[model samples]
Target: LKFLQQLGSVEMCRYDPLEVVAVKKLQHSTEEHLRDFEREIEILKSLQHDNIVKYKGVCYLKLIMEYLPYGSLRDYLQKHKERIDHIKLLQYTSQICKGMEYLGTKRYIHRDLATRNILVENENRVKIGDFGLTKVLPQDKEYYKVKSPIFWYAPESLTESKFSVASDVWSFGVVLYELFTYIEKSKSPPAEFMRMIGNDKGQMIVFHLIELLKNNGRLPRPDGCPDEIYMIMTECWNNNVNQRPSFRDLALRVDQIRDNMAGGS
Candidate 1:
């Protein structure tokens, strides 16, 4: 805590802004793991866009980054669920797709994409973060780590290690699920759930989400929720990865959803 205080003081002390700073023993993982993490950071540094988090310089010990005042998307949703609407969710989700699309263009796949990895800068801006599980694939091979998100992952990721640009698209669908659903489950859904999706044993669950929305119209306000978002959620969790929409296409659709809701242009 004392060291963190000093770090905060240093951040305050700066006259000229420092985008990043490295602190010793700052990482909890082993050196090899840290190296892998650094590699991931390097990939982030290569990316430049409005929807993605900007990577600043890294000190040898601690990696400094831009501070997100609005905090993680997960925390933001939990704190202000009442304020969130379908149109607003669309706007935020569109930005996420934009970032994902940009990454796809670079041939990088965000294997662990979810709401928690997305950051809210304010009410209007969303930025994608956490590239640790990101993968860069050859044009010929993309199936890797198919079962990525235990709770929200596309069926293929769970069943097959094979992944592709399509798999990333599948992840975006999961993002849509998180955007609509309340944060009741753990970060990873249960292993039983993963097994069901992976083995094709738990597909009924997908239909259940859609039925909920059809019957309820809207998610429960404040805390309890409705199933309206489930319509999109079903598409993302489609058992066949090939059926999933591309991120670019998904981005445009999300835009349409926002516009349809009269949120903004």
Candidate 2:
């Protein structure tokens, strides 16, 4: 492979006429970080699906992965916000759900599944990427201590430092919100809200605000968002994690939406 360019700490290279790969090197990585990196590589190697980015191989502390030309879903959305049709949006959303469904079948939890981590290959085709925070679920595992974005994380994750398939469902709902609203950054709790936490608080103020919003706050459904689709998003944000739909169920619904869009248009 010939080196093409650098992407931050990662190197982008062309492997063949039609194939490109990105490599992330761990030159000065710590023992813990190295372990995590290796684990991530193993996790990726086990995944083989059209909706998931293909992991070619790894050398030393470097990870080699398929190079997606269209960049991330977030970047794609931002670039084609005005031109992208509802049908295309449904297609992309369905693809992501399918990818997550495959991960679910493998008993793996994608702790970070935002649009930023989802990659677009040729124009509209989406493949889930960035497995740095993904974890394989143990038989009896319920929660994890992994940290994620405050705004996109589930309540239990924020309060108990827990992560599960249900939490990933919650994040998928936020991704739906992102697709509809195109808000790139996390909307952190205000300083004034944090001030209310004061001293006797048992949990973070951001968690409290999230609870407040979950109960009383009316999330303004985006104007162009279909009622059925918005309903799916709301179901994903259910207060009880058990109430949230699984990735398989989500895939079914998203597929239906995609079909409906295709037929209607």
Candidate 3:
């Protein structure tokens, strides 16, 4: 029951005698060096939500987290050689919406909200992970963009370097796209999306993406993907920030869909 899951050079799983947890290491030898690291850890510790990864204290600069046996959602998606259950994917997306609802309430923007930053658990649950880029909302600013990612960002984020709760909603939509379009595990979103556009070497990839969205471009619907969820996903990519649905509303819609699917008997 106690195995290991490592990514790159980092030791992800903790195999111990009494307690099992995910170990995240931070390197710092002095108090001054630990300043920013300490603040991030405090943010992690303060976050207490079911759909968010639980922070289990630290030892030797290692941040401990509840280990999800199923591992990163990205890996799980990639490992499946064949398409998996659609309802299960729906369940995961709804759980993420619930988790995001809590994170937004806490005033933290997860700049990296891709499937890779989510963890799967037993009982068809998923939790948002990898909050290293999370930024506490700026008090005086309308929105903030601390760092990262070219593909999993909103048009505003790409063009103006702006990230808001609404932009995060856009990222959620990309994750929704990932869920529905599980045709090839090896096919990354950027790769699949690139195929949909012209290879105008005259412009950079980011510029091309911006041009695509400005024309109200959205990813193509997955084969047999339900219209209800697909519409919701496209709404997430809406260029009008004011039009994007809040995570709270997304959660509700997802629940309705999940329930409606259940009515199939």
Candidate 4:
């Protein structure tokens, strides 16, 4: 699928047989739905980042994407199972946050922000995919209702409350939980918890975890996970979206952790 190319005085990397295909389908849904779908792709085309999927170009048929060989984050999590390391897990999660922050800066909301949408390219390097529910919202637009990713949605999103940047922050919190739990696609404790939250008298299980760590000054360390890493995660899982650090801030915090660990060595 790759080829070597020569420019006047340089060599370049290229893929030979990649093809573009439009995602919109008229028969499967209403015109509104199709337009929304196509619009999402167009929005994605505007996004450019190492952590986000690179949109090579768009054809009338489809958007050409750079091939990611390792498949989705869900698959990788399942493969690693309980053995997923805390630091590496955060690295991937941090990358997702970077991508989300970039899209958020562009005023795009990825309603479906979950591990499944994150695709792995080179081992742990994550690239986010699946932009079907993405929308470019305007400033001063307080909120709107739309279906969010089921397992990772924030409590407000579950209640069909008007979604805003806060709702996306909530989903990112769920993703942080995923990194910590090492829970697989077929075995998601969060999904059951999310269902409970959707029901009446909902339990804020994730929020509880954060509170436990905050109050106790220690988290139940899964085997092989460092305490310091868990502390950063606890910050990420903070219940109040306003209390949660922005993705850019989160990235810097993670880097600080890495630096601390290195310095201790």
For model 2 the local lDDT of residue 229 reads 86
Per-residue lDDT of 37-134 in model 2, one digit per residue for the tens? 89999999999999998999987578898888887887788888888877778788888999998998888889887887888897668999788889
Using all chains and alpha carbons, the TM-scores for the candidates as numbered come to 0.73, 0.87, 0.87, 0.72
**1-265 in candidate 1: lDDT tens per residue?**
1133232212311214332222223346778778777777778789998888776766554444565567678888889988887777878888988898899888887887778788777899989866778888766765555332444445455445566777666667666666666444542334334443344534565554334333432222223323434555556555656777777777777677667658443
User: How well does candidate 4 score on lDDT at residue 36?
Assistant: 71
Candidate 4 global TM-score: 0.72
Q: What global local distance difference test value does model 4 have?
A: 0.62
Please report, in order, the local distance difference test score of every candidate based on alpha carbons. Answer: 0.63, 0.79, 0.79, 0.62
Top TM-score prediction, candidate number:
3
Counted clashes in each candidate structure: 18, 0, 0, 4
In model 2, the clashing pairs are none
So what's the TM-score on candidate 2?
0.87
lDDT by residue for model 4 (24-133), tens: 22346667866775786688778889998776664453445665666677777778666655557767876887888887788787787777678788776888877877
Model 3 over residues 1-265: C-alpha lDDT tens digits? 1447664213566556675677776554578646656766778898988889898887767667787877778777767626567777888888899888988888888778888888777646888877777778889875895534677889999888888899999999989988777635435567765876665452378888888889987787777788998999899989999999999999999888888787882
TM-score of 1: 0.73
Instruction: Tell me which of candidates 1 and 3 scores higher on lDDT.
Output: 3
lDDT value for candidate 3? 0.79
